[PDB]
Protein backbone atom coordinates (compact mmCIF):
# COMPACT_ATOMS: atom_id res chain seq x y z
CA UNK A 1 0.00 0.00 0.00
CA UNK A 2 1.57 3.24 -1.24
CA UNK A 3 -0.09 6.32 0.24
CA UNK A 4 -0.08 9.75 -1.39
CA UNK A 5 -1.91 12.98 -0.50
CA UNK A 6 -5.11 13.45 -2.53
CA UNK A 7 -4.18 16.74 -4.16
CA UNK A 8 -1.63 19.49 -4.60
CA UNK A 9 -1.85 22.91 -6.26
CA UNK A 10 0.32 25.87 -7.30
CA UNK A 11 0.44 28.76 -9.77
CA UNK A 12 2.10 28.36 -13.17
CA UNK A 13 5.90 28.51 -13.11
CA UNK A 14 6.03 27.22 -9.54
CA UNK A 15 7.25 23.92 -8.09
CA UNK A 16 5.20 21.15 -6.50
CA UNK A 17 6.19 17.86 -4.88
CA UNK A 18 4.23 14.64 -4.48
CA UNK A 19 5.25 12.09 -1.88
CA UNK A 20 4.65 8.34 -1.94
CA UNK A 21 5.11 6.78 1.51
CA UNK A 22 5.14 3.01 1.99
CA UNK A 23 6.36 0.13 4.16
CA UNK A 24 9.73 -1.64 4.18
CA UNK A 25 8.41 -4.74 2.38
CA UNK A 26 7.23 -2.98 -0.78
CA UNK A 27 9.46 0.09 -0.85
CA UNK A 28 12.85 -0.33 0.84
CA UNK A 29 14.74 -2.46 -1.65
CA UNK A 30 12.59 -1.99 -4.75
CA UNK A 31 12.70 0.70 -7.42
CA UNK A 32 9.93 3.28 -7.82
CA UNK A 33 8.22 4.49 -10.99
CA UNK A 34 5.91 7.48 -11.51
CA UNK A 35 2.94 7.64 -13.87
CA UNK A 36 1.03 10.63 -15.20
CA UNK A 37 -2.64 10.17 -16.11
CA UNK A 38 -4.84 12.69 -17.92
CA UNK A 39 -8.50 11.52 -17.57
CA UNK A 40 -9.22 11.10 -21.30
CA UNK A 41 -5.93 9.44 -22.27
CA UNK A 42 -3.66 6.45 -21.59
CA UNK A 43 -1.50 6.59 -18.44
CA UNK A 44 2.09 7.52 -19.17
CA UNK A 45 5.43 6.59 -17.59
CA UNK A 46 7.17 9.66 -16.14
CA UNK A 47 9.96 8.14 -14.08
CA UNK A 48 11.42 4.69 -13.54
CA UNK A 49 14.23 3.31 -11.40
CA UNK A 50 13.71 6.08 -8.82
CA UNK A 51 15.18 8.96 -10.85
CA UNK A 52 15.47 7.93 -14.50
CA UNK A 53 13.20 9.44 -17.15
CA UNK A 54 12.11 7.87 -20.44
CA UNK A 55 12.61 10.91 -22.69
CA UNK A 56 11.18 12.96 -24.14
CA UNK A 57 9.67 13.67 -20.74
CA UNK A 58 11.38 16.95 -19.79
CA UNK A 59 13.75 17.52 -16.88
CA UNK A 60 11.01 19.58 -15.24
CA UNK A 61 10.07 16.20 -13.75
CA UNK A 62 12.42 14.63 -11.20
CA UNK A 63 12.19 11.72 -8.79
CA UNK A 64 13.91 10.87 -5.53
CA UNK A 65 13.72 8.28 -2.77
CA UNK A 66 14.38 8.37 0.98
CA UNK A 67 14.63 4.77 2.13
CA UNK A 68 10.91 3.99 2.01
CA UNK A 69 9.26 7.21 0.82
CA UNK A 70 9.54 8.24 -2.81
CA UNK A 71 9.03 11.79 -4.02
CA UNK A 72 8.05 13.20 -7.42
CA UNK A 73 8.87 16.86 -8.08
CA UNK A 74 7.57 19.11 -10.87
CA UNK A 75 9.17 22.48 -11.58
CA UNK A 76 8.05 25.15 -14.04
CA UNK A 77 4.44 24.05 -13.64
CA UNK A 78 2.34 24.51 -16.77
CA UNK A 79 -1.30 23.91 -17.72
CA UNK A 80 -0.50 20.59 -19.40
CA UNK A 81 0.75 19.15 -16.12
CA UNK A 82 -2.79 19.03 -14.71
CA UNK A 83 -3.38 15.29 -14.22
CA UNK A 84 -3.41 12.48 -11.69
CA UNK A 85 0.04 11.24 -10.62
CA UNK A 86 0.72 7.74 -9.25
CA UNK A 87 3.80 6.07 -7.83
CA UNK A 88 4.26 2.34 -8.37
CA UNK A 89 6.54 -0.49 -7.23
CA UNK A 90 7.02 -4.07 -8.36
CA UNK A 91 7.58 -6.60 -5.54
CA UNK A 92 7.29 -9.99 -7.29
CA UNK A 93 10.02 -10.93 -4.92
CA UNK A 94 8.41 -13.38 -4.95
CA UNK A 95 4.77 -13.93 -5.98
CA UNK A 96 3.47 -10.45 -4.96
CA UNK A 97 2.72 -8.22 -7.95
CA UNK A 98 2.69 -4.47 -8.53
CA UNK A 99 1.24 -1.85 -6.20
CA UNK A 100 0.19 1.70 -7.14
CA UNK A 101 -0.08 4.92 -5.15
CA UNK A 102 -3.51 6.29 -4.20
CA UNK A 103 -2.71 8.77 -5.75
CA UNK A 104 -2.50 12.56 -6.27
CA UNK A 105 -4.34 15.17 -8.37
CA UNK A 106 -2.25 18.15 -9.58
CA UNK A 107 -4.00 21.52 -10.02
CA UNK A 108 -2.50 24.57 -11.74
CA UNK A 109 -3.97 27.86 -10.49
CA UNK A 110 -4.33 29.58 -13.87
CA UNK A 111 -7.06 32.07 -12.97
CA UNK A 112 -8.34 34.02 -9.94
CA UNK A 113 -10.70 32.27 -7.52
CA UNK A 114 -14.39 32.43 -8.33
CA UNK A 115 -17.05 31.78 -5.71
CA UNK A 116 -19.70 29.14 -6.49
CA UNK A 117 -23.29 29.97 -7.35
CA UNK A 118 -25.66 27.41 -5.83
CA UNK A 119 -29.05 26.40 -7.24
CA UNK A 120 -31.18 23.94 -5.27
CA UNK A 121 -34.26 22.48 -6.99
CA UNK A 122 -36.88 20.67 -4.89
CA UNK A 123 -38.59 17.53 -6.27
CA UNK A 124 -40.94 18.27 -9.16
CA UNK A 125 -44.63 17.50 -8.78
CA UNK A 126 -44.12 15.18 -11.73
CA UNK A 127 -41.49 13.25 -9.81
CA UNK A 128 -43.58 12.92 -6.64
CA UNK A 129 -46.37 11.66 -8.87
CA UNK A 130 -43.87 8.98 -9.91
CA UNK A 131 -43.50 8.05 -6.23
CA UNK A 132 -39.99 9.47 -5.92
CA UNK A 133 -38.32 12.59 -4.57
CA UNK A 134 -34.94 14.01 -5.56
CA UNK A 135 -33.37 17.24 -4.41
CA UNK A 136 -30.89 18.52 -6.99
CA UNK A 137 -28.09 20.87 -5.99
CA UNK A 138 -26.34 22.45 -8.97
CA UNK A 139 -23.13 24.41 -8.44
CA UNK A 140 -21.65 26.68 -11.09
CA UNK A 141 -19.10 29.34 -12.02
CA UNK A 142 -16.41 28.43 -9.47
CA UNK A 143 -12.62 28.11 -9.65
CA UNK A 144 -10.58 26.13 -8.78
CA UNK A 145 -12.59 23.01 -9.56
CA UNK A 146 -12.84 21.49 -6.10
CA UNK A 147 -15.75 21.56 -3.65
CA UNK A 148 -17.30 19.54 -0.85
CA UNK A 149 -21.05 19.28 -0.31
CA UNK A 150 -22.98 18.73 2.91
CA UNK A 151 -26.74 18.08 3.03
CA UNK A 152 -29.05 18.66 5.98
CA UNK A 153 -32.66 17.72 6.77
CA UNK A 154 -34.16 20.04 9.40
CA UNK A 155 -30.67 21.26 10.32
CA UNK A 156 -29.41 17.68 10.82
CA UNK A 157 -26.56 16.29 8.65
CA UNK A 158 -27.66 13.78 6.00
CA UNK A 159 -25.33 11.25 4.36
CA UNK A 160 -27.80 8.55 3.26
CA UNK A 161 -28.97 8.61 -0.35
CA UNK A 162 -26.40 11.25 -1.35
CA UNK A 163 -24.55 11.28 -4.68
CA UNK A 164 -22.11 13.89 -5.99
CA UNK A 165 -20.17 14.46 -9.19
CA UNK A 166 -16.58 15.58 -9.60
CA UNK A 167 -16.38 19.21 -10.83
CA UNK A 168 -16.46 19.53 -14.65
CA UNK A 169 -15.24 22.49 -16.72
CA UNK A 170 -17.97 24.78 -18.07
CA UNK A 171 -17.72 26.42 -21.49
CA UNK A 172 -16.43 29.60 -19.81
CA UNK A 173 -13.52 27.64 -18.30
CA UNK A 174 -14.90 27.82 -14.77
CA UNK A 175 -16.23 24.66 -13.13
CA UNK A 176 -19.63 23.24 -12.21
CA UNK A 177 -20.71 20.30 -10.05
CA UNK A 178 -23.93 18.57 -9.02
CA UNK A 179 -25.19 16.74 -5.95
CA UNK A 180 -28.38 14.77 -5.38
CA UNK A 181 -30.37 13.81 -2.29
CA UNK A 182 -32.76 10.88 -2.83
CA UNK A 183 -35.80 10.71 -0.60
CA UNK A 184 -39.22 9.09 -0.63
CA UNK A 185 -42.27 11.38 -0.89
CA UNK A 186 -42.96 10.68 2.79
CA UNK A 187 -39.46 11.70 3.84
CA UNK A 188 -39.64 14.89 1.77
CA UNK A 189 -43.03 15.72 3.32
CA UNK A 190 -42.09 14.81 6.90
CA UNK A 191 -39.40 17.50 7.25
CA UNK A 192 -39.80 21.26 7.39
CA UNK A 193 -36.54 22.17 5.65
CA UNK A 194 -33.65 20.74 3.59
CA UNK A 195 -30.36 22.43 2.73
CA UNK A 196 -27.44 22.07 0.33
CA UNK A 197 -24.20 23.49 1.69
CA UNK A 198 -21.29 23.90 -0.71
CA UNK A 199 -17.82 24.61 0.71
CA UNK A 200 -15.33 26.12 -1.73
CA UNK A 201 -11.91 27.39 -0.65
CA UNK A 202 -12.86 27.42 3.03
CA UNK A 203 -16.11 29.36 2.57
CA UNK A 204 -19.68 28.12 2.40
CA UNK A 205 -22.68 28.91 0.22
CA UNK A 206 -25.99 27.41 1.32
CA UNK A 207 -29.45 27.07 -0.24
CA UNK A 208 -32.59 25.75 1.46
CA UNK A 209 -35.93 24.34 0.25
CA UNK A 210 -39.14 23.16 1.90
CA UNK A 211 -42.44 21.62 0.78
CA UNK A 212 -44.45 24.69 -0.32
Amino acid sequence: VLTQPPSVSAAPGQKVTISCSGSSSNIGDNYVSWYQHLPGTAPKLLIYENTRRPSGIPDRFSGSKSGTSATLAITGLQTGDEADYYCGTWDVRPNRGAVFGTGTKVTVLGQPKANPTVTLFPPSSEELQANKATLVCLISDFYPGAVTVAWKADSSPVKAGVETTTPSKQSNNKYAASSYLSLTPEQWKSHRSYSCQVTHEGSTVEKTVAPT
Binding site: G88, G103, E126, L138, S140, T166, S168, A176, S178
Partner: protein
Protein backbone atom coordinates in the same frame (compact mmCIF):
# COMPACT_ATOMS: atom_id res chain seq x y z
CA UNK B 1 6.62 4.01 -31.52
CA UNK B 2 4.88 1.16 -29.66
CA UNK B 3 1.07 0.77 -29.81
CA UNK B 4 -1.45 -1.17 -27.69
CA UNK B 5 -5.19 -1.41 -28.41
CA UNK B 6 -7.65 -3.14 -26.06
CA UNK B 7 -10.93 -4.72 -27.17
CA UNK B 8 -13.71 -6.92 -25.82
CA UNK B 9 -15.28 -4.68 -23.19
CA UNK B 10 -18.99 -4.19 -22.61
CA UNK B 11 -21.79 -4.63 -20.08
CA UNK B 12 -22.31 -8.03 -18.42
CA UNK B 13 -24.11 -9.68 -15.50
CA UNK B 14 -22.25 -10.89 -12.39
CA UNK B 15 -21.21 -14.55 -12.48
CA UNK B 16 -20.66 -14.65 -16.23
CA UNK B 17 -17.37 -14.71 -18.14
CA UNK B 18 -15.71 -12.27 -20.52
CA UNK B 19 -12.47 -12.28 -22.49
CA UNK B 20 -10.51 -9.10 -23.18
CA UNK B 21 -7.87 -8.80 -25.89
CA UNK B 22 -5.00 -6.42 -26.50
CA UNK B 23 -3.50 -5.95 -29.97
CA UNK B 24 0.17 -4.95 -29.80
CA UNK B 25 2.01 -3.24 -32.65
CA UNK B 26 5.25 -1.43 -33.55
CA UNK B 27 7.51 -3.29 -31.12
CA UNK B 28 8.92 -6.78 -30.60
CA UNK B 29 5.97 -8.35 -28.77
CA UNK B 30 7.69 -11.70 -28.25
CA UNK B 31 10.51 -9.96 -26.38
CA UNK B 32 8.45 -8.15 -23.74
CA UNK B 33 6.35 -9.17 -20.77
CA UNK B 34 2.92 -7.52 -20.48
CA UNK B 35 0.40 -6.29 -17.90
CA UNK B 36 -3.28 -5.64 -17.25
CA UNK B 37 -4.31 -2.77 -14.95
CA UNK B 38 -7.80 -1.43 -14.16
CA UNK B 39 -9.35 1.80 -12.89
CA UNK B 40 -12.81 1.72 -11.38
CA UNK B 41 -14.87 4.90 -12.01
CA UNK B 42 -13.52 7.82 -9.99
CA UNK B 43 -10.70 5.82 -8.40
CA UNK B 44 -7.02 4.92 -8.72
CA UNK B 45 -5.08 2.34 -10.74
CA UNK B 46 -5.19 -1.27 -9.52
CA UNK B 47 -2.87 -3.96 -10.89
CA UNK B 48 -4.70 -7.15 -11.97
CA UNK B 49 -2.24 -9.46 -13.73
CA UNK B 50 1.12 -9.84 -15.41
CA UNK B 51 2.77 -12.27 -17.81
CA UNK B 52 6.47 -12.72 -18.61
CA UNK B 53 7.81 -12.46 -22.16
CA UNK B 54 7.89 -16.25 -22.60
CA UNK B 55 4.49 -16.72 -20.97
CA UNK B 56 5.98 -19.01 -18.33
CA UNK B 57 5.31 -16.81 -15.30
CA UNK B 58 1.80 -15.58 -14.48
CA UNK B 59 1.02 -13.25 -11.56
CA UNK B 60 -2.35 -12.03 -10.30
CA UNK B 61 -3.76 -9.74 -7.62
CA UNK B 62 -5.45 -11.67 -4.81
CA UNK B 63 -8.75 -9.97 -5.68
CA UNK B 64 -8.87 -11.77 -9.03
CA UNK B 65 -7.01 -14.95 -8.05
CA UNK B 66 -8.72 -18.10 -9.29
CA UNK B 67 -11.19 -16.08 -11.38
CA UNK B 68 -8.97 -14.45 -14.04
CA UNK B 69 -6.40 -16.01 -16.40
CA UNK B 70 -3.79 -14.08 -18.40
CA UNK B 71 -2.40 -15.46 -21.67
CA UNK B 72 -0.66 -14.47 -24.91
CA UNK B 73 -0.40 -15.40 -28.57
CA UNK B 74 2.84 -14.22 -30.16
CA UNK B 75 1.54 -15.44 -33.54
CA UNK B 76 -1.09 -12.70 -33.29
CA UNK B 77 0.79 -10.20 -31.10
CA UNK B 78 -2.23 -10.41 -28.81
CA UNK B 79 -2.51 -10.40 -25.02
CA UNK B 80 -5.65 -11.83 -23.38
CA UNK B 81 -7.48 -11.54 -20.08
CA UNK B 82 -10.01 -14.28 -19.43
CA UNK B 83 -12.34 -12.98 -16.75
CA UNK B 84 -14.61 -15.59 -15.18
CA UNK B 85 -17.10 -15.37 -12.29
CA UNK B 86 -17.39 -11.61 -12.69
CA UNK B 87 -18.45 -9.43 -9.77
CA UNK B 88 -19.88 -5.90 -9.62
CA UNK B 89 -16.60 -4.83 -8.01
CA UNK B 90 -14.79 -5.82 -11.24
CA UNK B 91 -16.40 -2.83 -12.97
CA UNK B 92 -13.53 -0.71 -14.35
CA UNK B 93 -11.66 0.58 -17.39
CA UNK B 94 -9.07 -2.07 -18.26
CA UNK B 95 -5.69 -1.01 -19.67
CA UNK B 96 -3.16 -3.18 -21.51
CA UNK B 97 0.48 -2.31 -20.65
CA UNK B 98 3.86 -3.35 -22.01
CA UNK B 99 6.78 -4.03 -19.73
CA UNK B 100 9.96 -2.05 -20.34
CA UNK B 101 12.56 -4.84 -20.39
CA UNK B 102 13.22 -6.68 -23.64
CA UNK B 103 14.33 -10.32 -23.52
CA UNK B 104 15.67 -12.86 -25.97
CA UNK B 105 14.77 -16.46 -25.26
CA UNK B 106 17.71 -18.33 -23.76
CA UNK B 107 16.01 -21.65 -22.92
CA UNK B 108 14.00 -23.79 -25.36
CA UNK B 109 11.70 -26.84 -25.58
CA UNK B 110 8.49 -23.28 -27.45
CA UNK B 111 10.50 -20.76 -25.44
CA UNK B 112 10.20 -21.43 -21.71
CA UNK B 113 12.75 -18.97 -20.37
CA UNK B 114 11.69 -18.20 -16.80
CA UNK B 115 13.06 -14.65 -16.51
CA UNK B 116 10.19 -12.66 -15.00
CA UNK B 117 8.93 -9.14 -15.60
CA UNK B 118 10.65 -6.00 -14.21
CA UNK B 119 7.32 -4.27 -13.57
CA UNK B 120 7.77 -0.91 -15.25
CA UNK B 121 4.71 -0.05 -17.37
CA UNK B 122 6.38 1.87 -20.22
CA UNK B 123 3.48 1.91 -22.70
CA UNK B 124 -0.26 1.87 -22.09
CA UNK B 125 -3.35 1.55 -24.25
CA UNK B 126 -6.44 3.77 -23.95
CA UNK B 127 -8.27 0.89 -22.29
CA UNK B 128 -11.59 -0.96 -22.67
CA UNK B 129 -14.53 -0.48 -20.31
CA UNK B 130 -16.08 -3.41 -18.43
CA UNK B 131 -19.37 -2.92 -16.57
CA UNK B 132 -20.67 -5.67 -14.30
CA UNK B 133 -24.21 -5.07 -13.02
CA UNK B 134 -27.41 -6.91 -12.10
CA UNK B 135 -29.46 -4.15 -13.76
CA UNK B 136 -31.20 -4.60 -17.11
CA UNK B 137 -31.38 -2.08 -19.98
CA UNK B 138 -33.71 0.76 -19.06
CA UNK B 139 -34.50 4.17 -20.50
CA UNK B 140 -34.63 7.26 -18.26
CA UNK B 141 -37.54 9.01 -16.64
CA UNK B 142 -37.13 12.73 -17.37
CA UNK B 143 -38.32 15.22 -14.73
CA UNK B 144 -38.29 19.03 -15.13
CA UNK B 145 -36.28 21.38 -12.93
CA UNK B 146 -38.38 24.53 -13.01
CA UNK B 147 -37.07 28.09 -12.44
CA UNK B 148 -38.35 30.53 -9.76
CA UNK B 149 -29.65 39.79 -12.63
CA UNK B 150 -32.49 39.11 -15.04
CA UNK B 151 -31.49 35.45 -15.27
CA UNK B 152 -33.05 32.14 -14.23
CA UNK B 153 -31.74 28.58 -14.15
CA UNK B 154 -33.82 25.64 -15.32
CA UNK B 155 -33.00 22.06 -16.27
CA UNK B 156 -34.06 18.44 -16.50
CA UNK B 157 -33.32 15.49 -14.25
CA UNK B 158 -32.60 12.36 -16.31
CA UNK B 159 -33.10 9.55 -13.82
CA UNK B 160 -32.85 5.76 -13.47
CA UNK B 161 -31.38 4.70 -16.81
CA UNK B 162 -28.96 1.90 -17.70
CA UNK B 163 -26.36 1.58 -19.13
CA UNK B 164 -24.47 4.78 -19.96
CA UNK B 165 -24.57 7.07 -21.85
CA UNK B 166 -27.41 9.50 -22.41
CA UNK B 167 -27.12 12.64 -24.52
CA UNK B 168 -28.95 15.91 -23.91
CA UNK B 169 -29.83 18.86 -26.14
CA UNK B 170 -32.14 21.85 -25.63
CA UNK B 171 -34.68 23.04 -28.20
CA UNK B 172 -33.35 20.56 -30.77
CA UNK B 173 -29.88 22.09 -30.55
CA UNK B 174 -30.86 25.71 -31.21
CA UNK B 175 -30.17 26.58 -27.57
CA UNK B 176 -26.46 26.14 -26.78
CA UNK B 177 -25.67 29.19 -24.63
CA UNK B 178 -25.20 28.61 -20.92
CA UNK B 179 -25.99 24.91 -21.24
CA UNK B 180 -24.14 22.45 -19.04
CA UNK B 181 -24.76 18.72 -18.90
CA UNK B 182 -23.30 17.04 -15.86
CA UNK B 183 -21.56 13.66 -15.57
CA UNK B 184 -23.69 10.71 -14.44
CA UNK B 185 -23.90 9.43 -10.87
CA UNK B 186 -24.41 5.76 -10.02
CA UNK B 187 -27.14 5.28 -7.43
CA UNK B 188 -27.15 2.40 -4.93
CA UNK B 189 -30.02 1.02 -7.02
CA UNK B 190 -27.52 0.35 -9.78
CA UNK B 191 -29.19 2.87 -12.09
CA UNK B 192 -27.59 6.06 -13.38
CA UNK B 193 -28.89 9.60 -13.15
CA UNK B 194 -27.68 12.95 -14.45
CA UNK B 195 -28.90 16.49 -14.93
CA UNK B 196 -28.62 19.18 -17.56
CA UNK B 197 -29.08 22.86 -16.80
CA UNK B 198 -29.35 26.08 -18.79
CA UNK B 199 -29.45 29.71 -17.63
CA UNK B 200 -31.89 31.87 -19.59
CA UNK B 201 -33.30 35.43 -19.51
CA UNK B 202 -35.87 35.64 -16.71
CA UNK B 203 -37.78 38.12 -18.90
CA UNK B 204 -38.59 35.56 -21.60
CA UNK B 205 -40.22 33.06 -19.22
CA UNK B 206 -43.92 32.33 -19.64
CA UNK B 207 -43.52 33.11 -23.35
CA UNK B 208 -40.38 31.18 -24.38
CA UNK B 209 -40.56 27.40 -24.66
CA UNK B 210 -37.66 25.28 -23.40
CA UNK B 211 -37.56 21.59 -24.27
CA UNK B 212 -35.10 19.06 -22.87
CA UNK B 213 -34.17 16.54 -25.61
CA UNK B 214 -32.94 13.30 -24.05
CA UNK B 215 -31.58 10.31 -26.00
CA UNK B 216 -30.66 6.86 -24.70
CA UNK B 217 -29.48 4.60 -27.52
CA UNK B 218 -29.18 1.37 -25.45
CA UNK B 219 -32.94 1.35 -24.82
CA UNK B 220 -33.69 3.09 -28.13
CA UNK B 221 -35.50 6.03 -26.52
CA UNK B 222 -35.95 9.69 -27.37
CA UNK B 223 -37.64 11.92 -24.78
CA UNK B 224 -38.66 15.54 -25.24
CA UNK B 225 -39.69 17.05 -21.91
CA UNK B 226 -41.06 20.56 -21.47
CA UNK B 227 -39.68 22.66 -18.61
CA UNK B 228 -41.97 25.53 -17.59
CA UNK B 229 -42.11 27.95 -14.61
CA UNK B 230 -45.19 26.33 -13.00
Amino acid sequence: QAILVESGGGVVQPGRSLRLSCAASQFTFSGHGLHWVRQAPGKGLEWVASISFAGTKMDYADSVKGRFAISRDNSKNTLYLQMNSLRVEDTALYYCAKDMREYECEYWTPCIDRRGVVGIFDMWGQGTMVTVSTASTKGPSVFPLAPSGGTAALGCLVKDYFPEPVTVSWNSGALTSGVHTFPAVLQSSGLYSLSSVVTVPSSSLGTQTYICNVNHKPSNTKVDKRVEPK
